[PDB]
Scaffold this motif. Structure first.
Motif, PDB file in Angstrom:
ATOM      1  N   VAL A   9       1.336  -1.335  -0.363  1.00  0.00           N
ATOM      2  CA  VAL A   9      -0.426  -0.214   0.042  1.00  0.00           C
ATOM      3  C   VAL A   9       0.642   1.162  -0.019  1.00  0.00           C
ATOM      4  O   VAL A   9       1.711   1.428   0.511  1.00  0.00           O
ATOM      5  N   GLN A  10       0.513   2.119  -0.991  1.00  0.00           N
ATOM      6  CA  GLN A  10       1.624   3.389  -0.809  1.00  0.00           C
ATOM      7  C   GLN A  10       0.263   4.591  -1.210  1.00  0.00           C
ATOM      8  O   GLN A  10      -0.852   4.653  -1.741  1.00  0.00           O
ATOM      9  N   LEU A  11       0.591   5.763  -0.509  1.00  0.00           N
ATOM     10  CA  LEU A  11      -0.253   7.116  -0.419  1.00  0.00           C
ATOM     11  C   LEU A  11       1.175   8.437  -0.880  1.00  0.00           C
ATOM     12  O   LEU A  11       1.181   8.063   0.139  1.00  0.00           O
ATOM     13  N   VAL A  12       0.941   9.127  -1.748  1.00  0.00           N
ATOM     14  CA  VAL A  12       2.303   9.711  -1.852  1.00  0.00           C
ATOM     15  C   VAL A  12       1.241  10.933  -2.220  1.00  0.00           C
ATOM     16  O   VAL A  12       0.357  11.529  -3.271  1.00  0.00           O
ATOM     17  N   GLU A  13       1.545  11.888  -1.558  1.00  0.00           N
ATOM     18  CA  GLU A  13       1.459  13.754  -1.320  1.00  0.00           C
ATOM     19  C   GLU A  13       2.062  14.215  -2.128  1.00  0.00           C
ATOM     20  O   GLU A  13       2.978  14.032  -2.654  1.00  0.00           O
ATOM     21  N   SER A  14       1.713  15.178  -2.770  1.00  0.00           N
ATOM     22  CA  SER A  14       2.291  16.031  -3.371  1.00  0.00           C
ATOM     23  C   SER A  14       1.437  17.597  -3.705  1.00  0.00           C
ATOM     24  O   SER A  14       0.305  17.752  -3.070  1.00  0.00           O
ATOM     25  N   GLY A  15       2.405  18.719  -3.892  1.00  0.00           N
ATOM     26  CA  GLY A  15       0.748  19.884  -4.480  1.00  0.00           C
ATOM     27  C   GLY A  15       1.517  20.698  -3.555  1.00  0.00           C
ATOM     28  O   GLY A  15       1.220  21.962  -2.997  1.00  0.00           O
ATOM     29  N   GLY A  16       3.043  20.044  -2.109  1.00  0.00           N
ATOM     30  CA  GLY A  16       3.184  21.412  -1.228  1.00  0.00           C
ATOM     31  C   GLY A  16       4.114  22.463  -1.658  1.00  0.00           C
ATOM     32  O   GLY A  16       4.034  22.642  -2.787  1.00  0.00           O
ATOM     33  N   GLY A  17       3.835  23.706  -0.956  1.00  0.00           N
ATOM     34  CA  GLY A  17       5.072  24.217  -1.079  1.00  0.00           C
ATOM     35  C   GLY A  17       4.411  25.331  -0.296  1.00  0.00           C
ATOM     36  O   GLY A  17       3.350  25.966   0.376  1.00  0.00           O
ATOM     37  N   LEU A  18       4.260  26.806  -0.814  1.00  0.00           N
ATOM     38  CA  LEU A  18       4.473  28.633  -0.172  1.00  0.00           C
ATOM     39  C   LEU A  18       2.871  29.087  -1.006  1.00  0.00           C
ATOM     40  O   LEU A  18       1.957  28.703  -1.861  1.00  0.00           O
ATOM     41  N   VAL A  19       2.498  30.121  -0.253  1.00  0.00           N
ATOM     42  CA  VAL A  19       0.591  30.216  -0.439  1.00  0.00           C
ATOM     43  C   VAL A  19       0.974  31.558   0.644  1.00  0.00           C
ATOM     44  O   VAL A  19       1.120  31.785   1.291  1.00  0.00           O
TER      45      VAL A  19
ATOM     46  N   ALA B 187      -9.723   4.960  11.964  1.00  0.00           N
ATOM     47  CA  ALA B 187      -8.466   3.806  12.423  1.00  0.00           C
ATOM     48  C   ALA B 187      -7.932   4.380  11.870  1.00  0.00           C
ATOM     49  O   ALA B 187      -7.747   2.957  10.570  1.00  0.00           O
ATOM     50  N   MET B 188      -6.514   4.759  11.644  1.00  0.00           N
ATOM     51  CA  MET B 188      -5.515   5.504  10.583  1.00  0.00           C
ATOM     52  C   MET B 188      -4.251   4.726  10.266  1.00  0.00           C
ATOM     53  O   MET B 188      -3.695   4.646  10.971  1.00  0.00           O
ATOM     54  N   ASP B 189      -4.317   3.285   9.609  1.00  0.00           N
ATOM     55  CA  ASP B 189      -3.321   2.252   9.754  1.00  0.00           C
ATOM     56  C   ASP B 189      -1.777   2.743   8.110  1.00  0.00           C
ATOM     57  O   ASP B 189      -1.349   1.830   8.398  1.00  0.00           O
ATOM     58  N   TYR B 190      -2.232   3.631   7.738  1.00  0.00           N
ATOM     59  CA  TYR B 190      -1.777   3.892   6.787  1.00  0.00           C
ATOM     60  C   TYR B 190      -1.269   5.441   6.383  1.00  0.00           C
ATOM     61  O   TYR B 190      -2.496   5.761   6.159  1.00  0.00           O
ATOM     62  N   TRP B 191      -0.384   5.915   5.846  1.00  0.00           N
ATOM     63  CA  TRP B 191      -0.263   7.176   6.237  1.00  0.00           C
ATOM     64  C   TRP B 191       0.841   7.462   5.041  1.00  0.00           C
ATOM     65  O   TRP B 191       1.828   6.739   4.731  1.00  0.00           O
ATOM     66  N   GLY B 192       0.786   8.289   4.441  1.00  0.00           N
ATOM     67  CA  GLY B 192       1.552   8.829   3.376  1.00  0.00           C
ATOM     68  C   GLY B 192       3.024   9.984   4.043  1.00  0.00           C
ATOM     69  O   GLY B 192       3.029   9.704   5.415  1.00  0.00           O
ATOM     70  N   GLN B 193       4.171   9.779   3.559  1.00  0.00           N
ATOM     71  CA  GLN B 193       5.561  10.702   3.825  1.00  0.00           C
ATOM     72  C   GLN B 193       5.199  12.033   4.502  1.00  0.00           C
ATOM     73  O   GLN B 193       5.900  12.190   5.648  1.00  0.00           O
ATOM     74  N   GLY B 194       4.288  12.817   3.713  1.00  0.00           N
ATOM     75  CA  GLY B 194       3.633  14.454   3.716  1.00  0.00           C
ATOM     76  C   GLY B 194       4.944  14.894   3.600  1.00  0.00           C
ATOM     77  O   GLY B 194       5.742  15.255   2.921  1.00  0.00           O
ATOM     78  N   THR B 195       3.632  16.256   2.969  1.00  0.00           N
ATOM     79  CA  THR B 195       4.754  17.513   2.097  1.00  0.00           C
ATOM     80  C   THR B 195       4.029  19.144   3.519  1.00  0.00           C
ATOM     81  O   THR B 195       2.847  19.301   3.979  1.00  0.00           O
ATOM     82  N   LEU B 196       5.358  19.382   3.113  1.00  0.00           N
ATOM     83  CA  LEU B 196       4.596  20.922   3.726  1.00  0.00           C
ATOM     84  C   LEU B 196       4.202  22.144   2.618  1.00  0.00           C
ATOM     85  O   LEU B 196       4.449  21.956   1.774  1.00  0.00           O
ATOM     86  N   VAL B 197       3.112  22.001   3.314  1.00  0.00           N
ATOM     87  CA  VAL B 197       2.472  23.950   3.887  1.00  0.00           C
ATOM     88  C   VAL B 197       2.924  24.999   4.500  1.00  0.00           C
ATOM     89  O   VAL B 197       2.724  24.491   5.710  1.00  0.00           O
ATOM     90  N   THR B 198       3.508  25.516   3.791  1.00  0.00           N
ATOM     91  CA  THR B 198       3.830  26.819   4.341  1.00  0.00           C
ATOM     92  C   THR B 198       3.397  28.598   3.490  1.00  0.00           C
ATOM     93  O   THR B 198       2.787  29.218   2.658  1.00  0.00           O
ATOM     94  N   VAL B 199       2.845  28.934   4.694  1.00  0.00           N
ATOM     95  CA  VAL B 199       1.314  29.936   4.633  1.00  0.00           C
ATOM     96  C   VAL B 199       2.252  31.416   4.948  1.00  0.00           C
ATOM     97  O   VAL B 199       2.022  31.631   6.072  1.00  0.00           O
ATOM     98  N   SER B 200       2.834  32.431   4.204  1.00  0.00           N
ATOM     99  CA  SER B 200       3.284  33.394   4.797  1.00  0.00           C
ATOM    100  C   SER B 200       3.205  34.306   3.365  1.00  0.00           C
ATOM    101  O   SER B 200       2.914  34.187   2.431  1.00  0.00           O
ATOM    102  N   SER B 201       3.326  35.831   3.452  1.00  0.00           N
ATOM    103  CA  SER B 201       3.570  36.727   2.863  1.00  0.00           C
ATOM    104  C   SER B 201       5.133  37.052   2.428  1.00  0.00           C
ATOM    105  O   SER B 201       5.619  37.698   1.697  1.00  0.00           O
TER     106      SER B 201
END
Lengths: 217, 210, 94, 94, 210, 222
Positions: F2-12, F108-122
């Motif tokens: 089983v695999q879960l891959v987040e993407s789309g993170g970054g700056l806002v 009951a969350m038995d599988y998880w992605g690696q995470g991606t950083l989302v940073t909200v700042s001017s």
């Protein structure tokens, strides 16, 4: 004392209208149960409608729904019946009546009017010709044929009320020309004939026609 | 509507009898009834309401019974005054009447007197020609009238009337009336009236000539 | 097929036209049979989906209604009868 | 003040939205609590104004709703659940 | 959002200890819970769900009890792999996480080595001064750093960071940075970092002069 | 697996929108239970949303209802987190996750992605200025001196730090960055070494900041 007086009866022609009134005294119609019962000639009583004016509630027989309308004017302590689209078989004496609160029943009709004739026919007001029924050749028969009058009723007496024993005056008949006809009859000593004058008095109120006819050998 | 049948439709009793009028109704078992009396030429008058309850003023000689579907009025000792037509009525919606039950007075059998009547000379000038037959003081009600014209019995050109029961002798009388035209009257000669009734060994005929 | 949100919103505690037998609402009135024998009344119905709470009225009012009150073996007659309605409903602790 | 005909005509045997308890409708589901616990179903409702007659369905039909199915001390999950509906109601005897 | 509450927020244990972590949740008596473990830089790992059911693979030294409103995570014999943060989470809607419970390794008290660093000439060029103070390899975590410029106690112009407990010696380290305009920096002589910590009989001060 | 891959993170910018993706494989998300959970820096796990695609059913934390929308593309086996009117407090690692039918429970969350950083700042992307934390001349003869690198005024996270290209790891602490009131981060890496080695041993911190493609190797000396 309680009184219920109808009026407004008379001629109507097919597909025409006519309102019936019922004037009440001795009681308050608004808190009461007023009815109209009708009755065709020679036939039995038919209940036709009902109002409880303070409840705003009316009921009717199925034979008049859509056409008839019971109502009441509190201020005139009178009830009404609006009769529309009248066919011929609505021909009847129309009573108004009430059920007082001596009976819980809404329909135990307790006091009554004297009734009022309503004739629905295309025929127009017309007086009777009166023809004699002469006797022939010690007990004889006499009479008058009162033909071609309209509407009902007719009255017949003999010798201005002085002759009553032996008299049988008959229910009218509808002739299919649409005009009524009847007979009054009397039995007498045959030895009377040639000295005793017999005069049927016929009176037809609706055409304003009085007629007297001597009946001779 | 709702249907209300009355039995018997008419009757013949004497003064002092026990009488029983039945009444059939197409109504719920909880729905009740009223009883009325009506004499000729008058308004009805309430006798009994709620099946069994004496409307005030009404003689104890009357009483009521039955429930739901079937209903029984009962006069214990019939009186001269009690000869009328008796109706029953639903106390529900619609509050429909029964057809009426006539109580006529019982008399022994009596011969109807009979009389032919030709048209007047006055009537013949009008074009119509009415000829009358009388049946005076008979009992009981049942009576056939037949207009034979040169031995040719008629149909659909006569009408009939009967009177109420008489006050003094308790008989009926009927007046039958052969209508015609002027020219049809001037066709034939022998016009007769032919009457059948229980108080007559055989049919009686009264006739004339023009 | 009815989405959960819609099921929830429509079942949750509120005043609803309920049909209520007249004899239930007037236990003692025994000498009468009623037509109609039942009436449309606004009453609290539904559920609070919470163990502590229950659906109950918080504003009530009366409504008067013409009713044919039938007395068996006797007669019948129109007449007015009053009934409790619920104008407002809430989930309250028991 | 509601006139007679109005009351009779509005309480006569017909399909009316009715809040019904799920557990009552499914007595066999002992291991679930339901959220909501009740559902709005169209169901025969009124009265027939005669003890020879009774209000019953002549035309039925199922509807599926999303119910949240709780297993006590375990967890909860959404699920579809079928319920019966009354589409046409009429006045019948026994 | 459902209200959760873990007790305690951190705990210090040694290998072989029985550890009991607790979790209060404002939910209905039929709602339950999950327990998770997370280590630094890694996603969480499901441990127990339905209050008491171990997830496949999870060692049996983990276990959970209770119902409705109160739950308990027990580790009966803490192993080196168990040092981690543990979270409870409601199983109702919404699935609110508790604030978590950090399980750290007990160890002997160690005093920090303390170093002070002036700002580089290269930074000063630009107009700002960062002075840094290192608290190296100490236990336990709690430690007070006070900045002093010319013997004036500094406030609101410093910031602080702490490493995760070291994987080998179980100590913590800390850096504090005091940041002044170059202007302010050149108005003052003596820069001091005053450290108080359980392993020190007296506060240690490290210092430089411009 | 089983695999879960987040993407789309970054700056806002604050006020802005940003859509996260979760590309699932090894199972069919259609009839499954997908979640988003996040974690602000040095803070706890916060459940944020839940979709059960086959039921068309979603649920959210109150901290985000009205702003965020979890949806799913049945045919790309991919779930999403659409995020609107983002604030500084939404700055977090966003984990995508899952509860298998192993558990009745939807949560009951038995599988998880690696995470991606989302940073909200001017703030705008900027590489670090890297400065010597020099070994003090007063370092003890016996021998333990500390030196390091102050890695200052960068944005956003993360930054990476090694010493002598991975050859020096004993004694190294690189600290969690702090968020300054400028909007820019700052951190220190530090190592302890024998004092007898200063002037003999070269020490270089290797700082990389991918978000701005910045490499800096700073030799730290007495």
């Amino acid at each position: 004392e309680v009184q219920l007086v109808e009026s407004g009866g008379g001629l109507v022609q097919p597909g025409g209208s006519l309102r019936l009134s019922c004037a009440a005294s001795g009681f308050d119609i608004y808190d009461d149960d007023i009815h109209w019962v009708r009755q065709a000639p020679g036939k039995g009583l038919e209940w036709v409608a009902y109002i409880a004016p303070s409840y705003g509630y009316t009921d009717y027989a199925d034979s008049v729904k859509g056409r008839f309308t019971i109502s009441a004017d509190t201020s005139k302590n009178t009830a009404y019946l609006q009769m529309n689209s009248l066919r011929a078989e609505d021909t009847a004496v129309y009573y108004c009546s009430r059920s007082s609160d001596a009976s819980y029943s809404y329909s135990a009709m307790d006091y009554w009017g004297q009734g009022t004739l309503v004739t629905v026919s295309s025929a127009s007001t017309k007086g009777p010709s009166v023809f004699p029924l002469a006797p022939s050749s010690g007990t004889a028969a006499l009479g008058c044929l009162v033909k071609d009058y309209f509407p009902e009723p007719v009255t017949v007496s003999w010798n201005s009320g002085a002759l009553t024993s032996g008299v049988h005056t008959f229910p009218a008949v509808l002739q299919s020309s649409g005009l009524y006809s009847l007979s009054s009859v009397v039995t007498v000593p045959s030895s009377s004939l040639g000295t005793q004058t017999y005069i049927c008095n016929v009176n037809h109120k609706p055409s304003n026609t009085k007629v007297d006819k001597k009946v001779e050998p | 509507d709702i249907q209300m049948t009355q039995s018997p439709s008419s009757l013949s009793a004497s003064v002092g009898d026990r009488v029983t009028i039945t009444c059939r109704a197409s109504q719920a078992s909880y729905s009740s009834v009223a009883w009325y009396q009506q004499k000729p030429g008058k308004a009805p008058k309430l006798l009994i309401y709620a099946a069994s309850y004496l409307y005030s003023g009404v003689p104890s000689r009357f009483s009521g019974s039955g429930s739901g579907t079937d209903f029984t009025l009962t006069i214990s000792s019939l009186q001269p005054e009690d000869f009328a037509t008796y109706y029953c009525q639903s106390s529900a919606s619609p509050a429909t009447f029964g057809q009426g039950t006539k109580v006529e007075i019982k008399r022994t059998v009596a011969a109807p007197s009979v009389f032919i009547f030709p048209p007047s000379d006055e009537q013949l000038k009008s074009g119509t020609a009415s000829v009358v037959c009388l049946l005076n003081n008979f009992y009981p009600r049942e009576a056939k009238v037949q207009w034979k014209v040169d031995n040719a019995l008629q149909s659909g050109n006569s009408q009939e009337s009967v009177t109420e029961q008489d006050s003094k002798d308790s008989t009926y009388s009927l007046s039958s009336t052969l209508t015609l035209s002027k020219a049809d009257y001037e066709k034939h000669k022998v016009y007769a009236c032919e009457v059948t009734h229980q108080g007559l060994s055989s049919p009686v005929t009264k006739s004339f000539n023009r | 097929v009815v989405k959960f949100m819609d099921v929830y919103q429509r079942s949750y505690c509120h005043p609803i036209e309920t049909l209520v037998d007249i004899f239930q609402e007037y236990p003692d009135e025994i000498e009468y049979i009623f037509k109609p024998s039942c009436v449309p009344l606004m009453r609290c119905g539904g559920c609070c989906n919470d163990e502590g709470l229950e659906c109950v009225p918080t504003e009530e009012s009366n409504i008067t209604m013409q009713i044919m009150r039938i007395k068996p073996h006797q007669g019948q007659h129109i007449g007015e009868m009053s009934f409790l309605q619920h104008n407002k409903c809430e989930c309250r602790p028991k």
